[PDB]
Design a protein around this ligand. Structure first.
Ligand code: COA
Ligand code: COA
Ligand code: BTI
Ligand code: BTI
Ligand code: BTI
Ligand code: BTI
Lengths: 506, 170, 506, 170
């Protein structure tokens, strides 16, 4: 019937041609165009195109708009099934009513049942006031479903516009949050309340813009220039991830060779003990084609985390970074790495660690901030993991830090060390200054004692002689060893006692 | 509160909640500090727990906060409310400013709208009429009801899918 | 506040004084009086007193009555928690709207989660037309929950008034249906439609009264004189049943003696083989105090089924009844006993069976009615059970019937027989007619051979010699043996393969 | 149909249903024959199954029948409808005679009310507006949709309590 086609053509127009033109003038795409750009051509199946809201108070009954401000459905990305929904800014400002929430909960529940990934795209305007208390009910159910799916299916959220109010909680409990650099922002309470209460004047961009939330607060995992870049990068990322917590990581045919040697690595460590080097170069030499998907690249830069591929399988990488703050461990780095390792363990992805750390950061600010617990978080994450763990000590490992960064004692399976490694309780100066306390009256004898202690104990051979290190390897072979090790370790099987869940510190 | 709730849940201890919350704390210091994830910790801890939860709304429950503090929707089992509870999206002033934005110029009309809204909507009976509240009780009976409810709720049994472990926002 | 007490007191009034007085004039209690009568004094806690409907069509918005026509909540009977809901005929005729359904679904879900029984009391008038398709949605959810709870918690339904249309399906999926003998009826389609379609004139009482459904259609499990008797009998029954599928049957202290003998049983079976005897007398001599809670007493009277007590534990009893149709099995008896045995097995109640059966009912009518499958249902139910089964072969077991009624071969644990038992492939006359066919003309030789076959093969000792019978007992001992046997059998443990569910012939 | 559905469910075979039902058969014969329980059998078999169920409504689905035949509420995964579907509580004539019982004598008025009711409510669009229908498709596409749908549905997994076995009516 033609009349049904007309109904469809009219439902596809949202809130009018005028609002779509205004949306385009801001430099933003519309919801359905995003859905079209994300999925493979011809695969999109839509649900519930004709739903309408059911409020009749405060004059709302005179304006019913089909769709109620959200587009939901499912399709395929690279042949693999995906569910998704996208909020529509042109319909009631993308707000969240009862029926809107009903569609969202339907799609979440179905996606959990089929065990497929979920993508959420947020462009909202907060709670619809005219609906009263009913609105709150909506939010509630959505939250619940998020938490039930956490650790069962990967959930990716993309913020491409305003997202004020309680709605913000929904993407915060997902595994990744991506933001668009020049048009998005998130906050719980907006500038008006801030002005009326604290008397400080602040714009929305300054209060919750992309930069604030990607550089200072730990919320966002990355930023992109515009919507197209963000959607294409989401498409790229989706090829690393497992579909659910039962099947293994996806595999593709690689063009690289597993037996190649790398002469350049023989000269990466600088001769002078005071000069730093760029760990990113090392990582990009170990991965197959040099392709590396960095996570939280702009926050807590003293540590590096990301996804790569080895022999056609996904691998997680964590590495200390000498270029900034001498690679020390502080609160931020600890939280970043702890959450990443927990995710990688939840879906059975193997982990590779590169260690170059002198210790923890001193100063009163860190101690008052609670460094104890945040530091403990990373140790907790590493020690409980049951996936394969391969670690490489490059240059330094001093004191307690040498124990949190995937030591052999906390459950690591293999531990290599380059010839330049220095594994000790602390630096030569302080160790000598303590052991020979009642001799510090001199200056030359202490220097001689320091030279002898440095010569004897600051090396990788005492650790090996105690058996804490499995093998000292030459740098040029590093890649090959990893590629081999991971293979043998694919069958790791271990079992723990029965607990409801852990009690990780918060 | 999130740490305490998770500890209670791990060893199968029941939880009672008393709610009186007007909202979140505003300001640049909190948002720059990362309020979103810290506040999400509590919601995450409450929604996943599988022990008896009993909540009592005493005075206020406004906006998104009403959801995190063990609402009926995120998995609370029983919800009682005293007669003085005020369950609403936001305070009367701001609500009326928002709804009637095209007439804020006056001062008597605004006061009239404020009084009407406050008397119609800031009560526990609109929320009760939708089934979000299990009963409106007299305050002096509160203890007895708790003592009864927990007594029955000992057998609560429910099962989730098979997960290695959760992915709580650290 | 006093305003709250006023509002609450006005919600307890339902549709007004006039409708309450009309209700009382017919001899029917109101919903709240039934609630007050069923539960222990002072235990009722009500949910959702103030719910109202949200339809705005056909002038419905001008009449909003608090409660929406159903009273729901929980309480205790004899100290044990029970949940229940009761429909209120004085509010919109107890019809079913959206919010109505929401209250029912909430109580059902809560009752399943906490593993307690559910009681439904029905006084309704069907589907509310004005609500349109939405009403149907309500129905669906309720049905679903019933199915989820079946075989996990016992569900009881009491029909105390009209119940028509879709509503009727909801109690049809419960375990027991009880009816009141003059103010109730059930049917899918009402008298007006029946007249319009078939031109037959019938009143509601003739079409679906208590008599019809307790004597012809097999739906209802019993009838009572008025509401008070019904509610007290429900409270008597509820003390027999286990609370869920994990905990055992309830136990109380018995006032009877586990070692008493009863001599009268030695003279129960008459010498003349053409005379019947009353089996119910035997069953009432075997239970502790002669208390027997009969199920479906007036339907398919050739078989007896019900609950009793032995040594303080509930036990199910199934027995053949010679007094009607010589005790033969037919379609109705097989279906009745099969459903009951499935219930007993589901909640781990032990079963005792008394067997006296000459075969199946002959005639073309039974054959056209499908006797083969109705007969197979009982065999299926008996052979799949994994609870203790004890059987007593009092007076006869001929041919195939001796196999369906819990023989040692289909999984009976202990099988006794009195001295009067006659176990054979068929009656003497027919057997000798078939074997000696070359000499059917004579009359003396046939009698001679018949006497020989009867004296040699119609007795329990040939069955014993092959070890099909575990022991031949003197009649006066029967009780003691059962009482001891069950004691040892409590620990019966046995494991089947993995199946989603059986494929019983429906 | 009940026995066939049970067999399909036991061995993990997906099920497709085509619905065109105006109600149940009236008459004393069926009632004395036990139509209640026999009807319940189909509802039971449909609602308990844990395999993919796909349903297509072609013309009519009136009354309680619309629920026994694998409606969304009892566990159907996907529900499509052709444009000619009529989802209502009952036929238009009967609905009007029930709602307007006071004026069942005036012919013309009744005919006008019937035409209004029929054009507004006997269609597949009111059911869709509440979200009970997943999509309204044009008929010529039917095959393709099924072929696609079943694919994504292969992985259906879901947990239920521990029962020895159900207590289906017989
Ligand atoms: C939504 C918000 C955070 C940002 O709004 P904005 O993009 O800067 O533009 P506006 O201030 O004019 O308001 C947004 C529009 O969506 C509507 N809108 C936004 N949020 C809404 C809500 N919670 N409820 C109802 N309508 C809403 C407004 O009516 C407004 O209408 P408009 O298109 O004529 O301008 C305030
Ligand atoms: C209960 C019933 C058997 C008759 O009850 P009764 O004691 O003899 O008294 P009434 O017939 O006058 O019904 C009383 C009230 O129940 C209400 N009622 C009963 N069932 C209802 C329903 N399914 N929907 C809406 N209202 C209903 C009626 O509106 C009526 O309201 P009123 O005060 O204005 O008269 C009848 O109401 C029923 O159950 N179904 C009616 C059959 C039908 O569906 N349509 C009518 C002819 S097809
Ligand atoms: C030389 O002057 C030593 C002083 C600095 C100590 C370093 S800073 C990094 C490590 N943290 C720590 O506890 N001590 C180490
Ligand atoms: C009234 O004038 C105060 C405005 C906000 C009310 C209170 S202040 C702290 C809470 N934050 C918020 O969102 N509103 C609450
Ligand atoms: C005497 O006339 C014998 C006829 C009946 C034989 C008996 S009646 C009960 C059993 N039914 C049957 O098939 N044969 C047995
Ligand atoms: C018009 O004359 C309608 C005939 C009767 C209504 C039909 S008969 C088949 C269905 N049964 C029922 O409950 N009503 C429907």
């Amino acid at each position: 019937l033609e009349k049904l086609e007309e109904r469809r053509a009219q439902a596809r127009l949202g809130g009018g041609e005028k609002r779509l033109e205004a949306q385009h003038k801001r430099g933003k795409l519309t919801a359905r165009e995003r859905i079209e750009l994300l999925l493979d051509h011809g695969s999109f199946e839509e649900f519930d195109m004709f739903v309408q809201h059911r409020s009749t108070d405060f004059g709302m009954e005179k304006q019913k708009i089909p769709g109620d401000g959200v587009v939901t459905g499912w399709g395929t990305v690279n042949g693999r099934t995906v569910f998704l929904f996208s909020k529509d800014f042109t319909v009631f400002g993308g707000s969240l009513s009862e029926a809107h929430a009903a569609k969202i909960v339907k799609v979440q529940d179905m996606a959990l049942k089929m065990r497929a990934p979920i993508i959420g795209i947020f462009d909202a305007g907060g709670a619809r006031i005219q609906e009263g208390v009913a609105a709150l009910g909506g939010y509630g159910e959505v939250f619940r479903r998020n938490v039930a799916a956490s650790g069962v299916i990967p959930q990716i959220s993309v913020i491409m516009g305003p997202c004020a109010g309680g709605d913000v909680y929904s993407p915060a409990m997902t595994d990744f949050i991506f933001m668009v650099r020049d048009t998005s922002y998130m906050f719980v309470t907006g500038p008006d309340v801030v002005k009326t209460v604290t008397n400080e004047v602040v714009t929305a961009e300054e209060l919750g813009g992309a930069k604030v939330h990607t550089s200072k607060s730990s919320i966002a995992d990355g930023s992109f220039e515009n919507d197209v870049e963000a959607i294409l990068q989401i498409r790229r990322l989706l090829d690393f991830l497992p579909a659910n917590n039962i099947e293994g990581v996806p595999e593709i045919e690689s063009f690289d060779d597993v037996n190649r040697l790398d002469k350049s690595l023989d000269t990466l460590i600088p001769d002078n003990p005071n000069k730093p080097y760029d760990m990113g170069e090392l990582i990009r030499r170990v991965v197959d084609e040099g392709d590396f998907f960095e996570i939280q690249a702009a926050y807590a830069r003293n540590i590096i985390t990301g996804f790569g591929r080895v022999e056609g399988r996904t691998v997680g990488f964590v590495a200390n970074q000498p270029l900034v703050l001498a690679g020390v461990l502080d609160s931020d780095a600890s939280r970043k790495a702890a959450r990443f390792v927990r995710f990688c363990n939840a879906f059975s992805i193997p982990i590779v660690t590169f260690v170059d750390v002198p210790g923890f950061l001193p100063g009163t600010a860190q101690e008052y901030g609670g460094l104890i617990k945040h530091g403990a978080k990373l140790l907790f994450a590493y020690s409980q993991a049951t996936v394969p763990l391969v670690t490489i000590i490059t240059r330094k490992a001093f004191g307690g830090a040498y124990d949190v960064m995937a030591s052999k004692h906390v459950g690591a399976d293999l531990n290599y060390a380059w010839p330049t490694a220095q594994i000790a309780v602390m630096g030569a100066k302080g160790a000598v200054e303590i052991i020979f306390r009642a001799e510090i009256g001199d200056a030359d004898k202490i220097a001689e004692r320091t030279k002898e202690y440095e010569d004897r104990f600051l090396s990788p051979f005492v650790a090996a002689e105690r058996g804490y290190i499995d093998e000292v390897i030459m740098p040029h072979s590093t890649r090959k060893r990893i590629a081999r090790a991971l293979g043998m370790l694919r069958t790791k099987e271990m079992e723990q006692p029965w607990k409801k869940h852990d009690n990780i510190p918060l």
